[PDB]
Amino acid sequence: AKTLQRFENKIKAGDYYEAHQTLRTIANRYVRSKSYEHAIELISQGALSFLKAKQGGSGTDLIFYLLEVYDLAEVKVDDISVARLVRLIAELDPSEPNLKDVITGMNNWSIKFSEYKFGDPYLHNTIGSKLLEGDFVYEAERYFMLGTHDSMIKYVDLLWDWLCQVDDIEDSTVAEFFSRLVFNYLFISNISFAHESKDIFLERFIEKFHPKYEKIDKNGYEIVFFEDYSDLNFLQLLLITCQTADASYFLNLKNHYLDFSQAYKSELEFLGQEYFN
Amino acid sequence: KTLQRFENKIKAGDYYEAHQTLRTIANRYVRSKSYEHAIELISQGALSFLKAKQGGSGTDLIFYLLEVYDLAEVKVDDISVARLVRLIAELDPSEPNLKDVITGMNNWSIKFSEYKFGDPYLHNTIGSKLLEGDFVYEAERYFMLGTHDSMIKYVDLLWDWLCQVDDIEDSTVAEFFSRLVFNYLFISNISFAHESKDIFLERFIEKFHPKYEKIDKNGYEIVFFEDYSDLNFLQLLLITCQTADASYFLNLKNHYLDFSQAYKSELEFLGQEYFN
Amino acid sequence: TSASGPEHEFVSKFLTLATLTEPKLPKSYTKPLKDVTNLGVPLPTLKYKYKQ
Amino acid sequence: TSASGPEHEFVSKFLTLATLTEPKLPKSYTKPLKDVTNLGVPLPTLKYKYKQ
Amino acid sequence: VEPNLHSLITSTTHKWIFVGGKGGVGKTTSSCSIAIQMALSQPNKQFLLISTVPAHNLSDAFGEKFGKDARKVTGMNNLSCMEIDPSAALKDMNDMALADLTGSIPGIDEALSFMEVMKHIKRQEQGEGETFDTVIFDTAPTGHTLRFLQLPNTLSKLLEKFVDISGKLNELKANVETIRQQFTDPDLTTFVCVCISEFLSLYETERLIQELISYDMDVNSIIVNQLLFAECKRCQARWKMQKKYLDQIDELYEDFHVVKMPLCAGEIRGLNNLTKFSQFLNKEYNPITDGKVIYELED
Amino acid sequence: VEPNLHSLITSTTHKWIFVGGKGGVGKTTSSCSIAIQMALSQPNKQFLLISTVPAHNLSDAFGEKFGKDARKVTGMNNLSCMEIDPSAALKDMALADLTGSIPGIDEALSFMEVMKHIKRQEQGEGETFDTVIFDTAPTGHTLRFLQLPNTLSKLLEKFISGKLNELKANVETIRQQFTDPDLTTFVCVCISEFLSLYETERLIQELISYDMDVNSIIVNQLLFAECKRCQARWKMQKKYLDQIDELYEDFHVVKMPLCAGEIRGLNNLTKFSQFLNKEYNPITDGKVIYELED
Ligand SMILES: Nc1ncnc2c1ncn2[C@@H]1O[C@H](COP(=O)(O)OP(=O)(O)OP(=O)(O)O)[C@@H](O)[C@H]1O
Ligand SMILES: Nc1ncnc2c1ncn2[C@@H]1O[C@H](COP(=O)(O)OP(=O)(O)OP(=O)(O)O)[C@@H](O)[C@H]1O
Numbered sequence A: 001a002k003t004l005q006r007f008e009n010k011i012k013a014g015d016y017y018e019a020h021q022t023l024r025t026i027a028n029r030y031v032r033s034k035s036y037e038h039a040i041e042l043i044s045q046g047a048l049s050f051l052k053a054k055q056g057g058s059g060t061d062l063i064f065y066l067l068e069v070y071d072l073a074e075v076k077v078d079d080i081s082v083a084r085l086v087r088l089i090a091e092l093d094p095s096e097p098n099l100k101d102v103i104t105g106m107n108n109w110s111i112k113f114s115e116y117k118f119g120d121p122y123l124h125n126t127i128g129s130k131l132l133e134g135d136f137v138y139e140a141e142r143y144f145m146l147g148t149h150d151s152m153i154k155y156v157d158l159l160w161d162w163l164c165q166v167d168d169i170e171d172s173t174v175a176e177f178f179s180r181l182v183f184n185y186l187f188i189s190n191i192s193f194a195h196e197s198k199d200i201f202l203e204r205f206i207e208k209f210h211p212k213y214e215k216i217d218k219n220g221y222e223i224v225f226f227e228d229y230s231d232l233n234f235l236q237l238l239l240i241t242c243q244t245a246d247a248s249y250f251l252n253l254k255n256h257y258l259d260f261s262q263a264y265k266s267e268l269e270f271l272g273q274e275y276f277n
Numbered sequence B: 001k002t003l004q005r006f007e008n009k010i011k012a013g014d015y016y017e018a019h020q021t022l023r024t025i026a027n028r029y030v031r032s033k034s035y036e037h038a039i040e041l042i043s044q045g046a047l048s049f050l051k052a053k054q055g056g057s058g059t060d061l062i063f064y065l066l067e068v069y070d071l072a073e074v075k076v077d078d079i080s081v082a083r084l085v086r087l088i089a090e091l092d093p094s095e096p097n098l099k100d101v102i103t104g105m106n107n108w109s110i111k112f113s114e115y116k117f118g119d120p121y122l123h124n125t126i127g128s129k130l131l132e133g134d135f136v137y138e139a140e141r142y143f144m145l146g147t148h149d150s151m152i153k154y155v156d157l158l159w160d161w162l163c164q165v166d167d168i169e170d171s172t173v174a175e176f177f178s179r180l181v182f183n184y185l186f187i188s189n190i191s192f193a194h195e196s197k198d199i200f201l202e203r204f205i206e207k208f209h210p211k212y213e214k215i216d217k218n219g220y221e222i223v224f225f226e227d228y229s230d231l232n233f234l235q236l237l238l239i240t241c242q243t244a245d246a247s248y249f250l251n252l253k254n255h256y257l258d259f260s261q262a263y264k265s266e267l268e269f270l271g272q273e274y275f276n
Numbered sequence C, D: 001t002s003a004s005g006p007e008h009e010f011v012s013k014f015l016t017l018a019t020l021t022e023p024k025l026p027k028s029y030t031k032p033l034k035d036v037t038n039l040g041v042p043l044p045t046l047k048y049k050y051k052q
Numbered sequence E: 001v002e003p004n005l006h007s008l009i010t011s012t013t014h015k016w017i018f019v020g021g022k023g024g025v026g027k028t029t030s031s032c033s034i035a036i037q038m039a040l041s042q043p044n045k046q047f048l049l050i051s052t053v054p055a056h057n058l059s060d061a062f063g064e065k066f067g068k069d070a071r072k073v074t075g076m077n078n079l080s081c082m083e084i085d086p087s088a089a090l091k092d093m094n095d096m097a098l099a100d101l102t103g104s105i106p107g108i109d110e111a112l113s114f115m116e117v118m119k120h121i122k123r124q125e126q127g128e129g130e131t132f133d134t135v136i137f138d139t140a141p142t143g144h145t146l147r148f149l150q151l152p153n154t155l156s157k158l159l160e161k162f163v164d165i166s167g168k169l170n171e172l173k174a175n176v177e178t179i180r181q182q183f184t185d186p187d188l189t190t191f192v193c194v195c196i197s198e199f200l201s202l203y204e205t206e207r208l209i210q211e212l213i214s215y216d217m218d219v220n221s222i223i224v225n226q227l228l229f230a231e232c233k234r235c236q237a238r239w240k241m242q243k244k245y246l247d248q249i250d251e252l253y254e255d256f257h258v259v260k261m262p263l264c265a266g267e268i269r270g271l272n273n274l275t276k277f278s279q280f281l282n283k284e285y286n287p288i289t290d291g292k293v294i295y296e297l298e299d
Numbered sequence F: 001v002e003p004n005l006h007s008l009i010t011s012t013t014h015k016w017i018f019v020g021g022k023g024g025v026g027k028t029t030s031s032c033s034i035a036i037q038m039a040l041s042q043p044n045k046q047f048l049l050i051s052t053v054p055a056h057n058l059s060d061a062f063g064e065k066f067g068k069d070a071r072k073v074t075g076m077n078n079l080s081c082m083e084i085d086p087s088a089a090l091k092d093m094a095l096a097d098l099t100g101s102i103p104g105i106d107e108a109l110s111f112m113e114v115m116k117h118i119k120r121q122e123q124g125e126g127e128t129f130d131t132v133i134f135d136t137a138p139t140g141h142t143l144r145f146l147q148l149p150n151t152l153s154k155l156l157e158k159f160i161s162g163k164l165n166e167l168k169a170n171v172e173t174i175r176q177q178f179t180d181p182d183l184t185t186f187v188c189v190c191i192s193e194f195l196s197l198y199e200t201e202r203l204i205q206e207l208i209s210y211d212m213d214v215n216s217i218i219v220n221q222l223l224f225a226e227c228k229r230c231q232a233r234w235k236m237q238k239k240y241l242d243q244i245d246e247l248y249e250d251f252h253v254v255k256m257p258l259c260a261g262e263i264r265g266l267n268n269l270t271k272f273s274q275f276l277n278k279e280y281n282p283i284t285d286g287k288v289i290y291e292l293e294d
């Protein structure tokens, strides 16, 4: 209680070490009395501040401590629950040596107290952006993968901005980026995202590289046929083919693109397991 | 300017002080590899602590000596065993770690000698010590692998035990006698087997006065007891092992069926040692 | 041009065939993330470095 | 007496037989303790307590 | 909260009393005190002061030499010590390239120390009785000590996930599960931490204690040793720092048995001087009444 | 024998410098000093202060929070710390959990981190630190950790094949560089008290038998009186102090005074560490003792 004053004092005084623990000791006291709500607020708040003061250590510690309480008080995953953690994620230094740790800590909690096997979507969007701040592209790609619509937007931009950065682009180069969107979203069975991500990416590819093409439409579906990117064509046809779940179409598409069936061996194999039983 | 220092503390009543001070100074000799100096310092210091009835400190130094012994690779000889023997005499038979000390040196006696079980001379001293602590069985073994004196104390150990018996029996006497015969026959010490058997049988006869008659032939004598079939069997077994003749062994066992079952394990080994 | 005619006739025909009857999975379909069990097969690593 | 005659005739005869020719191991024999490999078979524990 | 350890010192239910904390504080000295104070306060009871610390200091504290076999403390009638040495502890049980290499492996200290604890449990079951009513421990710093206190649980969670070989398994689970329920019983086992008046000690204490309660261990004591209690320039200056951490101590541990202790004018050794300083753990130190005993331990 | 640790502090060959001794003495404080004194004396070199002690105190000494990932000490340009925590160390890399709660896990892991720096120099990745000061635990458990190289070897011997070769080599290197008086030395932390002094003599004797370099002995918490207690306690310290000069005459004995408070923060730590470079002198530095208060 009255001690609270004396420590925040040490904070706004230049004694980070002092304040961090003093708070923790007082915090552990709240938990001891099972006054969880009080603890959650104390710890969480104190962390954010340490992060704002650029005190990576102390801050990261409290963040975990909060999670520890979260799992102790069995805090269910909801808006207010995710909010606190999200708020903290924004103050985390993308260079924090234990970034991935923090990310995992909360995501784990999001899973244990939710019906999502991979964590809460909303929380993912925030986490994804953070990982990218640390140039952890691959790690980010996955979180956005299982995120919200915004995650999709950042995901397509993540790949696109990467494709452009390429100095020695190639016919197969474009496929390396595009295929990811199609496959990844086809793995989590998110046809809506697969189509929208594919739409934004293909349009940007066309308005920048100006590849000679002609749109082929039929029954409502459209395939942006590229005269110099056979890979892109195959990948687009694969998307629609998975929607039909028809074994014949799957076999026909692969028999025509023998090399692409070998270049996307593993992927096509799983697709036959998910959309063809 | 140091040896006095602690001994001044020892007299002033500071055993703790002197013991370690000595050890620290001792380890210094070892550090300079001046083994001989260490051996003397430690050894002497121990004896004194033992004479002062300081079981702890004393026992510690004794081991420390052995530690150096094994470090300087001190070979097992008269002077080497002597020091340890001298110390064994000052050891309190009640020392909680008696067996430890005993094993410590005996182990050393083995590592630096051709004896697989340790130096005989050292055994005689160790054996007596164990007995002081009433560790009869443990003593029996060391005397077993000791000197002539060990044999004398061994027979006395068993004999004095047999007499202490209040409810003696026909098979009772066998429990003691058989040990001598078997034990010495195991280490192939016919000389000891005969002499130990002689002193024991004579004492058994001059105290219990069992009706008997000595049977002689070709130089060998079997004190036939009219009421101790076990003793007879045991005596015959001794000589039989000397012949190493399979037939005799079979004949002796076939006549004493029950004794062949009572001494099953033993006879089995005897057929492995004296009959291949 | 007519250099990529063979593949064009395939893509165009395959599409027509794959959409005669409404596919089993509509474009506005999205398996709730509460049901996703696995993340499919790991894709290969891009030979390009990232930054921003 | 003649109560233990049967065994006496055995012990006496066995001795005579086992000593016609000098036994392979003389009474003055003693395997140097430097050669003893094992201590034979463990004997049973006496049912008497020791002290002195 | 009574500023003394009387409740415990006189307790008749307790059987295991640990003494831990950061190093250098005096876990051996304080334990030496707790030992003497209980053997004197509880006549008809036999006590044992065993040190699981690889670097035994009980022999140094009391003075006399302790080994692998229990040895009554000179001067006491019902108080023995031990101090298990891994090396010698493996040569005795073995003589009775693996055995040697076993006493040189990190953690061997704990493992064996626990085996000795198992030895006292197996005895009460064997009908042989008990050789000691209570046991004071001279543990090592906070860290490694907690590892030893986790041995019961670990040895259990491991033993579980497992021809007389079936009998052993039974005499193994039991002996362990007992030590487990024994330590989780606030009346049979408690924890006494040894700290000083300095941040790095105080804070490490708060941490150590929190862990203990999560282990379901009884913590009903806190000794604040090496206090100056000034009123030269350094002593008055250092006392200033001590009073700073002292007041904070009264806060964090208000519902705890806080027993302050002064800094002698020398080292406290030998049952003689040890008992003279231990009396303050029974009856809180008072400058007004005991302001001269502080200098009595010198020389 | 120079009463300072200059020879080492300025040494350019050493890479591993252990700091052990009984507890409470100040193995973390003294190490904090040795660390600052080397990073300042050796500019073009990067130093690491890792604590293998389960109960980490480096964070307490300096003040700032250290974790599983190396963190440069605030104020220094070439000095980082670590402090390996078994639990978190096993979660990052029903068995795993139970592994970070087993006695000895501290040593094992601490050694794995040592293996990590060895595997790196071989991997061609280079070295991240020139010298490493250790904040070991009391004498006992510490010796156990120092025996890990030999034990891990004598065990590894009595035994993807290329992986075991990489391990065998890495560890062996440690064995070779640890027995080298120029690459690794030992600095003991003791006070002016029997139970400390005597435990020191013992600890040191073991070290030499381990073939470990012991070229330093710090005598901390000395009063150097000239109240009644300080003068009385100084009397005892001088008693053990004179004996110290005897047992360690051919050793680098560096005495150290008792401050009027706790020594923390790179600021006050460096102020007290200067005495390990240039022996304390009551005539010239008789006022610095009270400068660390507050
Ligand atoms: N109450 C006290 N007053 C004054 N000095 C003390 C006190 N307690 C301990 N000491 C000092 O500390 C020494 C005893 O340390 P011990 O208490 O032996 O350390 P330790 O507990 O064994 O360290 P560790 O716990 O890591 O093994 C003595 O030499 C003495 O000078
Ligand atoms: N020169 C000194 N004079 C007085 N007190 C000191 C000095 N150096 C360190 N200390 C005290 O010791 C503390 C540091 O203890 P550390 O040195 O952290 O103990 P420790 O070595 O970790 O104990 P352990 O070895 O059992 O883990 C500081 O809080 C300080 O108060």
Ligand SMILES: [Mg+2]
Pocket (backbone or CB within 6 Å): E026, E027, E028, E029, E053, E057, E138, E139
């Ligand atoms: Mg201690």
Ligand SMILES: [Mg+2]
Pocket (backbone or CB within 6 Å): F026, F027, F028, F029, F057, F135
């Ligand atoms: Mg330390």
Ligand SMILES: [Zn+2]
Pocket (backbone or CB within 6 Å): E232, E233, E234, E235, E236, F227, F228, F229, F230, F231
């Ligand atoms: Zn003073």
